[PDB]
Design goal:
This is part of a larger assembly, with 2 copies of chain A.
Chain A (H helix, E strand, L loop, with lengths): L3 E4 L10 E3 L5 E5 L6 E5 L8
Antiparallel strand pairs in A: 1-4, 2-3, 3-4
PDB class: viral protein
Keywords: SARS-CoV-2 Spike Protein Trimer, viral protein
Entry title: Mink Cluster 5-associated SARS-CoV-2 spike protein (S-GSAS-D614G-delFV) in the 1-RBD up conformation
């Protein structure tokens, strides 16, 4: 993927590796080396007017 | 089978009138939609990510 990775207050169960939004979008992950939960946010985008 | 309302024979005759001797002030609420949420999609980013 591509995005901004940040420390998070999500509480994954021990077997869970990814987190998903209401509409199937991945919005968190577990780092497989040191088992922190990272919130994924899109890199900033918008129209130019 | 649904009922359309209570039946009512109006007390008509060629020389009878009904006249109201009192009134009520009624306050009624009408709700109307006026706008949607304004949306735009970067469709290179929707289609191709
Ligand atoms: C991976 O190695 C690091 C080395 O610092 C260690 O801290 C961590 O506990 C290890 N994680 C797993 C899942 O083995
Ligand atoms: C008209 O209605 C009010 C209540 O809405 C009542 O107090 C009053 O006595 C009535 N007047 C007559 C003439 O019936």
């Amino acid at each position: 993927g591509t995005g901004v990775l940040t420390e998070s207050n999500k509480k994954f169960l021990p077997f869970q590796q990814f987190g998903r939004d209401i509409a199937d979008t991945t919005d968190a992950v577990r780092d497989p080396q040191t088992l922190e939960i990272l919130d994924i946010t899109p890199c900033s985008f918008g129209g130019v007017s | 089978t649904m009922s359309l309302g209570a039946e009512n024979s109006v007390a008509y005759s060629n020389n009878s009138i009904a006249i109201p001797t009192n009134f009520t002030i009624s306050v009624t609420t009408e709700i109307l939609p006026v706008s949607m949420t304004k949306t735009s999609v970067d469709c290179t980013m929707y289609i191709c990510g």
